[PDB]
Amino acid sequence: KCNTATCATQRLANFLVHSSNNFGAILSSTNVGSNTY
Amino acid sequence: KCNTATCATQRLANFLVHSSNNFGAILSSTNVGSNTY
Amino acid sequence: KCNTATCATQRLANFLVHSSNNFGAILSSTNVGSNTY
Amino acid sequence: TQRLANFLVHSSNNFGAILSSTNVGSNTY
Amino acid sequence: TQRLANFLVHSSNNFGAILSSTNVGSNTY
Amino acid sequence: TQRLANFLVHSSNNFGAILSSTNVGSNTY
Amino acid sequence: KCNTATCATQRLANFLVHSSNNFGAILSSTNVGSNTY
Amino acid sequence: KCNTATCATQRLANFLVHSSNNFGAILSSTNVGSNTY
Amino acid sequence: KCNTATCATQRLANFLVHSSNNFGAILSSTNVGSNTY
Amino acid sequence: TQRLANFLVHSSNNFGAILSSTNVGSNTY
Amino acid sequence: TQRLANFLVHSSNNFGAILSSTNVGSNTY
Amino acid sequence: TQRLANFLVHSSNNFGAILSSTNVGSNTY
């Protein structure tokens, strides 16, 4: 390939595997800036 | 390829796998800026 | 390819797989700016 | 035997500038 | 035996500028 | 035997500038 | 007057004299909530 | 007056004299909530 | 007056004299909540 | 001797909910 | 002798909820 | 003799909730 001069190479292999198998109950509440009076 | 001069290469391989298999109940509430009086 | 000079190459391969198989109940509420009196 | 007398006088005299804001139960976004 | 007397006088005299805002139950976005 | 007398006078005289803000129950974002 | 019992008296004499004699120039600007772009 | 019993008296004499004699220039600006861009 | 019993008296005499004689220049600026960009 | 090449691609794919507020020069009272 | 190449790609993929507020030059009272 | 190459890729993938507030030049009272 670069036999003679100045050859730069960045090799990036990124693999992401997000898996959620929910055989059940997940409950979530996000209350940002909310208020209860 | 770049036998002589100044060859740059960025190689990016990105693979993302988001999988959600919900065999069940997911409950979610996002209350942003909301208010309850 | 670029035997002589000044060759640049950005190689980007992006693969995204979002899969949701919901064999069940998902409930979601987003209340932004909403208010309840 | 209750003898009750209540006398109330409210007197307001503005000779200038009044600015008022009340937000019982508001939300400003 | 209840003898009750209630006297109320409200008197407002503006000689200038009044500005008022009330938002019982409002939302401004 | 209750003999009760309540006398209340409220008198406000502005000769200049008044600014007021009240937010019982508000949210400003 | 109240020789025997339970006499109450509130005596209020209020006198207000606002006088402005302007032998000259008064300039005033009230800009409430106004905006200039 | 109240020779025998329970006589109360509040005596209030209020006198206010606001006088402005402006033989000259008064300049005033009140900018509440105003904005200039 | 109250020779026998329980006689209370509050005596209030209030006199206020605000006088401004401006033989000259008064300049005033009140900028509440105002902004200049 | 200027040789100029500018290539720009903007690609936006919403698969869900987007809420946006911009107040360049506003005032909410 | 200027040889210039500029390549820009912006790619945004929302798969969910986005909320944004920008107040360059605002005032909320 | 300037040979210039600039390559920029911005890629954003939200799979969830994003909340953002920016107040370059604001005032909240």
Swiss-Prot record, chains D, E, F, J, K, L:
Its assembly, as annotated, is: Can form homodimers. Interacts with IDE and INS. Interaction with INS inhibits homodimerization and fibril formation.
Report the locations given in the UniProt record: Secreted
Q: Which organism is it from?
A: Homo sapiens (Human)
Q: What is the documented function of this protein?
A: Amylin/IAPP is a glucoregulatory peptide hormone that plays an important role in the regulation of energy homeostasis. Selectively inhibits insulin-stimulated glucose utilization and glycogen deposition in muscle, while not affecting adipocyte glucose metabolism. IAPP function is mediated by the CALCR-RAMPs (AMYRs) receptor complexes. Amylin can also bind CALCR receptor in the absence of RAMPs, although it is more selective for AMYRs.
Miscellaneous notes: IAPP is the peptide subunit of amyloid found in pancreatic islets of type 2 diabetic patients and in insulinomas.
Record PTM text: Amyloid fibrils are degraded by insulin-degrading enzyme IDE.
Q: Which residues form a coiled coil?
A: none
Query: Positions modified as Tyrosine amide?
Result: Y29
Sequence similarity: Belongs to the calcitonin family.
| Part of the full-length chain shown | 42 to 70 of 89
Provide the protein name.
Islet amyloid polypeptide
This protein's domain notes: The mature protein is largely unstructured in the absence of a cognate ligand, and has a strong tendency to form fibrillar aggregates. Homodimerization may be the first step of amyloid formation.
